[PDB]
């Protein structure tokens, strides 16, 4: 399994808007949820994007794909830009273990992250 993330780099103008697109390729698991995340420029620590406002997210579980779509972009927004697909797996399918382990659930279940590479944002000044 693995997470394509495009556009792996991305410059826009202030005032418009970006849509990240992230598929789970090579799975032999579901998509059961997603999260999104960014580092803002000139720093170093990653936080959380809350779904809502300028943020707005589509998800098809049925080809496994995710995007975000960020309206209204100012140049603040600049950083990088990360998806990730969540999911399920047994403790010895070792087939499913590679990415992040997120927690795990009595009777064997193991919670799994998959991150997309990045996407690199530069908005520029009004």
């Given at each position: 399994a693995w997470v394509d993330q495009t556009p792996r780099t991305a410059t826009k103008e202030t005032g418009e808007s970006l849509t990240i697109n992230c598929v789970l390729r090579d799975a032999?698991?579901?998509?059961?949820?997603?999260?999104?995340?960014?580092?803002?420029?000139?720093?170093?620590?990653?936080?959380?994007?809350?779904?809502?406002?300028?943020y707005v997210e589509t998800?098809?579980?049925?080809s496994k794909s995710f995007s975000l779509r960020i309206s209204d972009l100012r140049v603040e927004d600049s950083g990088t830009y990360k998806c990730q697909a969540f999911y399920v797996f047994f403790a010895e399918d070792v087939g499913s273990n590679k990415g992040?382990?997120?927690?795990?659930?009595?009777?064997?279940?193991?919670?799994?992250?998959?991150?997309?590479?990045?996407?690199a944002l530069t908005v520029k000044a009004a």
């Open positions: 032999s698991f579901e998509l059961k949820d997603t999260g999104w995340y960014r580092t803002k420029l000139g720093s170093t620590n990653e936080q959380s994007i809350s779904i809502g406002g300028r998800v098809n579980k049925g992040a382990i997120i927690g795990l659930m009595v009777g064997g279940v193991v919670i799994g992250g998959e991150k997309g590479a990045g996407t």
